């Protein structure tokens, strides 16, 4: 009683395992060295540490189980009932942690540049540690619906085989559709809005200041850091859109099609696209330390001096 197994080309599977292991080692080393560096203004440090922490947790928790339980053993849950519940709870709590961290960092930069007094009053290390603990608690509360919706179900030929058991939303399609579509709706269309518009008006302020920097009498070799700030700004916004759009387009695709439209080709495309979407979310969670590293070439020096 073995069905629902998807017969893919093994060279594509080996080639995405190699990508997954490369993102694994790069994200773990980058996030480990950034937390050690930030651990050795204070609020943006705790914000970057919280986002890097959430990305390290999404890698070390989600990566090896998703690896072993979708790539190698494609059908059985290795981890049991609480394993499914804890996996989707962690995964979605980390997704809300990452999305709300990038929201908070973009609001903090918009605050830090366009409202300096209001950012002075909104920022205190007591308030920032309370705020990050609040945002981790809110990501856990918004991940409680991935606890109660999800579970085990046996979809064998008669529903009684011990290997026909899968890990699936055990609720009907309308409830599934509303829960997953409000997740993708608020968790993505609100961070795309705040990141895009805030970072756009920051980039406007920085490009006017660059055009007022080309004060050449005052200026040392320090117009590189303003262009680098424009580049890191734009790298943040573009990386967040490109990395967290296909994952929710995939979940939308799971959300709307009621199986009357599914074929074998879209079935196979969905499984390969699932692999690619988890590749992109791990590209996000691994390329945060990269594009915080490479722009701050003195903080980068601090990284490589502590590493050497």
């Amino acid at each position: 009683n073995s069905d629902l197994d998807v017969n893919t080309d093994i060279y594509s599977k080996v080639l995405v395992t190699a990508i997954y292991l490369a993102l694994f080692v790069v994200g773990t080393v980058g996030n480990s060295v950034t937390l050690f560096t930030l651990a050795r203004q204070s609020t943006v440090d705790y914000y970057l540490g919280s986002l890097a922490l959430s990305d390290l947790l999404i890698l070390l928790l989600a990566m090896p189980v998703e690896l072993y339980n979708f790539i190698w053993v494609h059908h059985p849950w290795a981890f049991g009932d609480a394993g499914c519940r804890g996996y989707y709870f962690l995964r979605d709590a980390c997704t809300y942690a990452t999305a709300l961290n990038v929201v908070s960092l973009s609001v903090e930069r918009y605050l830090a540049i366009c409202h300096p007094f209001k950012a002075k009053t909104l920022m205190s290390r007591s308030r920032t540690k309370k705020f990050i603990s609040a945002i981790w608690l809110a990501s856990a509360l918004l991940a409680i619906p991935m606890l109660f919706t999800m579970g085990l179900q046996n979809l064998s030929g008669d529903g009684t085989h011990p290997g026909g058991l899968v890990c699936t939303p055990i609720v009907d399609t309308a409830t599934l559709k509303v829960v997953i579509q409000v997740n993708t709706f608020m968790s993505f269309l609100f961070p795309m809005l705040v990141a895009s518009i805030l970072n756009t008006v920051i980039a406007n302020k920085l490009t006017v200041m660059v055009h007022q920097a080309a004060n050449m009498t005052i200026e040392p070799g320090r117009v590189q850091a303003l262009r680098r700030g424009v580049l890191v700004l734009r790298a943040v916004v573009i990386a967040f859109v490109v990395c967290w759009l296909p994952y929710h387009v995939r979940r939308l695709m799971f959300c709307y099609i009621s199986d009357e439209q599914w074929t074998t080709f879209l079935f196979d495309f969905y499984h390969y696209f699932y692999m690619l979407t988890n590749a992109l979310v791990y590209v996000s969670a691994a390329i945060n330390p990269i594009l915080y590293n490479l722009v701050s070439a003195n903080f980068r020096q601090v990284f490589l001096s502590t590493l050497a």
């Binding site: 999800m150 979809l155 899968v166 890990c167 599914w262 499984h271």
Partner: peptide
Amino acid sequence: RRPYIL
């Protein structure tokens, strides 16, 4: 044929 994958 519905994928259970999510």
